[PDB]
Amino acid sequence: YMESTVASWYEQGILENIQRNKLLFIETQDGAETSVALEKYQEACENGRGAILLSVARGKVSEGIDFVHHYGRAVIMFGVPYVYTQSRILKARLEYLRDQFQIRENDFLTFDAMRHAAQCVGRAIRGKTDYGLMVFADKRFARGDKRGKLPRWIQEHLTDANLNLTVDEGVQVAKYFLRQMAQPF
Amino acid sequence: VRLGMMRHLYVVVDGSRTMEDQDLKPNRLTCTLKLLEYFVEEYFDQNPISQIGIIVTKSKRAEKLTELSGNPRKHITSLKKAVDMTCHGEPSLYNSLSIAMQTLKHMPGHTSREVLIIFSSLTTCDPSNIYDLIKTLKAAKIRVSVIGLSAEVRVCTVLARETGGTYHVILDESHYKELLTHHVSPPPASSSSECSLIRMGFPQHTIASLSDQDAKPSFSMAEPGLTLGGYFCPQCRAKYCELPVECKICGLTLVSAPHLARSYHHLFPLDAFQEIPLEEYNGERFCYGCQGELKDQHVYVCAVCQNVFCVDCDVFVHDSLHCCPGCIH
Amino acid sequence: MKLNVDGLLVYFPYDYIYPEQFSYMRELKRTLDAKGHGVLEMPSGTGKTVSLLALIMAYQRAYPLEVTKLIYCSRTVPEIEKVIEELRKLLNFYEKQEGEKLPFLGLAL
Amino acid sequence: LNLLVIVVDANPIWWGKQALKESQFTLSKCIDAVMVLGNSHLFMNRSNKLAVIASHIQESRFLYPGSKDGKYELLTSANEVIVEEIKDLMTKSDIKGQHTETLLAGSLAKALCYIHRMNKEVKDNQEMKSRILVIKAAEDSALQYMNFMNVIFAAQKQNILIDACVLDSDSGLLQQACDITGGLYLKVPQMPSLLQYLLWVFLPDQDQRSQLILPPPVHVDYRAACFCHRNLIEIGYVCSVCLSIFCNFSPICTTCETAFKIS
Amino acid sequence: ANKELEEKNRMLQEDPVLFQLYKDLVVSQVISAEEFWANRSDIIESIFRTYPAVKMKYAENVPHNMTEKEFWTRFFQENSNAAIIKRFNHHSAMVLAAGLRKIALNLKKSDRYYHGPTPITSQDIINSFQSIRQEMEAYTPKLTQVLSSSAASSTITALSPGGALMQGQMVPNDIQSELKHLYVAVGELLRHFWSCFPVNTPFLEEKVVKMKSNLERFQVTKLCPFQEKIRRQYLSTNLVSHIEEMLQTAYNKLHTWQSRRLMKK
Ligand SMILES: [Zn+2]
Ligand SMILES: [Zn+2]
Ligand SMILES: [Zn+2]
Ligand SMILES: [Zn+2]
Ligand SMILES: [Zn+2]
Strands B253-254 and B61-69: unpaired
Chains that touch B (3 or more CB pairs under 8 A): A, D, E
**CA-based nearest residue in chain E for residue B216:** E242
Answer whether D217's CB lies under 8 Å from B205's CB: no
- Of A21, A22, A182, nearest to B152 by CB-CB distance is A182
**Alpha-helix residue ranges (DSSP H) falling in B83-164:** 93-105, 130-140, 154-163
Q: Residue C106: how many CB atoms within 10 A of its CB?
A: 14
Distance CA A181, CA B174 (A): 18
Which stretches of B4-138 are assigned E, i.e. beta strand? 7-14, 51-58, 61-69, 112-118
Contacts of A44 (CB under 8 A, 6+ apart): A23, A25, A50, A51, E96
Contact D16 E120 (CB under 8 A): no
Resolution of the coordinates, Å: 4.3
H or E segment to which residue B198 belongs: strand B198-201
Which stretches of chain D are assigned E, i.e. beta strand? 4-8, 52-54, 62-64, 131-132, 161-162, 235-238
Per-residue H/E/C for E203-244: CHHHHHHHHHHHHHHHHHHHHHHHHHHHHHCCCCCCCCCHHH
Residue D101, class by beta-carbon neighbours within 10 Å (0-12 exposed, 13-18 middle, 19+ buried)? middle
Residue A161, class by beta-carbon neighbours within 10 Å (0-12 exposed, 13-18 middle, 19+ buried)? exposed
CA contacts within 13 A on the Cβ side of E154:
12
Q: Could you give the angle at the alpha carbon of A16 between the alpha carbons of A12 and A17, nearest 5°?
A: 105
Answer whether D150's CB lies under 8 Å from D113's CB: no
Residues of E in contact with D36 (CB under 8 A): 142, 146
Contact D28 E152 (CB under 8 A): no
Cα(E201) to centroid(ligand 5), Å: 25
Chains that touch C (3 or more CB pairs under 8 A): A
H or E segment to which residue B263 belongs: none
Q: Taking the mean position of all CA atoms in its chain, how far away is CA E71? A: 50
Mutating which of A67, A126, A130 best tests the C interface, going by the most C Cβ atoms within 10 A? A126
C38 is in an annotated binding site: no
How many Å is the Cα radius of gyration of chain A?
A: 18
Backbone φ/ψ region at D201: left (φ over 0), alpha (ψ -120 to 50), beta = alpha
C43 is in an annotated binding site: yes
Looking at this protein, which amino acid is placed at residue B269? P
Method of determination?
cryo-EM
Distance CA D204, CA D45 (A): 12
Which are the residues after which chain E is interrupted (C to N > 2.5 Å)?
A: 40, 77, 102, 120, 168
Determine the distance in angstroms separating the CA of B326 from the nearest CA of chain E, rounded to an integer: 16
Classify each residue of B40-58 as buried b or exposed e, where b means 16 or more C-beta atoms within 10 Å of its C-beta: beebbebbbbbbbbbbbbb
Looking at this protein, which amino acid is placed at residue E122? S
Contact B235 E194 (CB under 8 A): yes
- Of E103, E104, E194, nearest to B249 by CB-CB distance is E194
Backbone φ/ψ region at C15: left (φ over 0), alpha (ψ -120 to 50), beta = alpha
Cα(D157) to centroid(ligand 3), Å: 22
Distance CA D58, CA D6 (A): 19
Q: Could you give the angle at the alpha carbon of A181 between the alpha carbons of A178 and A183, nearest 5°?
A: 115
Answer whether B220's CB lies under 8 Å from E180's CB: no
Residue D51: which of D132, D138, D157 has the closest Cα? D132
Under DSSP, the state recorded for D262 is P
Residue D133: which of D259, D260, D8 has the closest Cα? D8
Cα(A149) to centroid(ligand 1), Å: 78
Contact B152 A47 (CB under 8 A): no
For residue E189, the SS3 value is helix
Which CATH code for domain A1-182?
Answer: 3.40.50.300
The ligand placed nearest to the CA atom of residue B233 is 1
Answer whether B202's CB lies under 8 Å from D221's CB: no
Question: DSSP letters along B199-222, please?
Answer: EEE----B--SBTTBT---B----
Q: Residue A128: how many CB atoms within 10 A of its CB?
A: 10
Name the maximum alpha-carbon separation found in chain E.
Answer: 115
End-to-end CA distance of chain D: 59
**CA-based nearest residue in chain A for residue C76:** A64
Answer whether B216's CB lies under 8 Å from B206's CB: yes
C-alpha pair distances (Å), A119 with each of A133, D65, D93:
15, 73, 84
Determine the distance in angstroms separating the CA of E134 from the nearest CA of chain D, rounded to an integer: 8
For residue D238, the SS3 value is strand
CA contacts within 13 A on the Cβ side of C62:
16
Based on DSSP, count helices (H) and strands (E) in chain D, helices before strands. 8, 6
Question: DSSP letters along D144-176, please?
Answer: GHHHHHHHHHHHHHHT-EE-B--BSS--HHHHH
B54 has which bridge partners? B11, B66
H or E segment to which residue C78 belongs: helix C77-98
Strands A23-26 and A74-78: unpaired
- Of B6, B196, B262, nearest to D153 by CB-CB distance is B262
End-to-end CA distance of chain B: 27
End-to-end CA distance of chain A: 41
The domain spans of chain A are 1-182
Distance CA B175, CA B113 (A): 25
For residue B266, the SS3 value is helix
H or E segment to which residue A26 belongs: strand A23-26
Residue E129: which of D166, D31, D167, D89 has the closest Cα? D89
Cα(D38) to centroid(ligand 2), Å: 23
Estimate the crossing angle of helix D73-91 against helix D27-44, to 10 degrees: 150
Under DSSP, the state recorded for E5 is H
Q: Residue C75: how many CB atoms within 10 A of its CB?
A: 9
Is cis: bond before C43, omega within 30 of 0? no
Answer whether D189's CB lies under 8 Å from E164's CB: yes
Cα(D156) to centroid(ligand 2), Å: 21
Distance CA E102, CA E93 (A): 15
Residues of E in contact with D242 (CB under 8 A): 107
For residue D191, the SS3 value is helix
C89 is in an annotated binding site: no
